[PDB]
UniProtKB/Swiss-Prot annotation:
Effect noted on mutating E31A: Strong ATP-binding. Strong interaction with HSF1, HIF1A, ERBB2, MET, KEAP1 and RHOBTB2. No effect on interaction with TSC1
Positions of the UniProt region annotated as Interaction with NR3C1: 2-207
Family under the similarity heading: Belongs to the heat shock protein 90 family.
Descriptive protein name: Heat shock protein HSP 90-alpha
Domain free text: The TPR repeat-binding motif mediates interaction with TPR repeat-containing proteins like the co-chaperone STUB1.
Source organism of this protein record: Homo sapiens (Human)
Lineage: Eukaryota, Metazoa, Chordata, Craniata, Vertebrata
Length: 207
């Protein structure tokens, strides 16, 4: 397991998300489902020129998996996934420019719910999670696990878990006071409100 330091910009954004008082937290699901949808679009478009791109799995879907025992909400997609380079360097670049843009928009009057317009909606996960674990598999790399509980650092290591084929799993280790997002009625309510038109089947698992 390797440990990396977040750059100043993104670290500050993560702290604002965790410290700022904001009641409309439910938007985190909309943002994560949107990112899954985008990743699914990417692998699908690539498969149009190179069909073998789907040898690692032809199904294009999104699964929402709540687990009360572990107090986690997992979003799983069979999208393009992320390579090690994406996890450590590429997305670090996007996180910096996106954070800078978003922070300047906030001082103007932009709301936290507009975070997705700046390419850093992923971080809205910290509105409800104390820790986020990302398990991902890209065709050009091996399966990796990225993880961070804020505090200025994150980790990356090869994942020895169940082989995914291709895609991304975003595991949200929910804060003690945010367990409503593990309730079937609550999740269904949110999906219908913000993601009813996503072009991929969204299956809400139950327990
Ligand atoms: O939302 C997605 N991805 C995010 C992301 C988005 C924007 C900026 C950084 C990061 C990041 C980082 C990340 N943030 C950093 C900040 C600084 N340095 C390295 C960094 N890596 C680490 C893991 C995951 C992610 C995503 C991509 C493809 N399909 C997906 N399906 C479901 C999510 C998903």
């Amino acid at each position: 397991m390797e440990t990396f330091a977040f750059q100043a910009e993104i670290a500050q954004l993560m702290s604002l998300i965790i410290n700022t008082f904001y009641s409309n937290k439910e938007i985190f699901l909309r943002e994560l489902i949107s990112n899954s949808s985008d990743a699914l679009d990417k692998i699908r478009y690539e498969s149009l020129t190179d069909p073998s791109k789907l040898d690692s799995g032809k199904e294009l879907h999104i699964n929402l998996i709540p687990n009360k025992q572990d107090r986690t909400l997992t979003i799983v997609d069979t999208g393009i996934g992320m390579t090690k380079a994406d996890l450590i360097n590429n997305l670090g670049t996007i996180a910096k420019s996106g954070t800078k843009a978003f922070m300047e928009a906030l001082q103007a009057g932009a709301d936290i719910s507009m975070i997705g317009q700046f390419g850093v909606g992923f971080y809205s996960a910290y509105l409800v999670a104390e820790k986020v674990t990302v398990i991902t598999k890209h065709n050009d790399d091996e399966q990796y696990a990225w993880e961070s509980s804020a505090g200025g650092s994150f980790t990356v290591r090869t994942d020895t878990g169940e082989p995914m084929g291709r895609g991304t799993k975003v595991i949200l280790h929910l804060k003690e006071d945010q367990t409503e997002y593990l309730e079937e009625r609550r999740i269904k309510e949110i999906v219908k409100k913000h993601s009813q038109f996503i072009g991929y089947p969204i299956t809400l698992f139950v327990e």
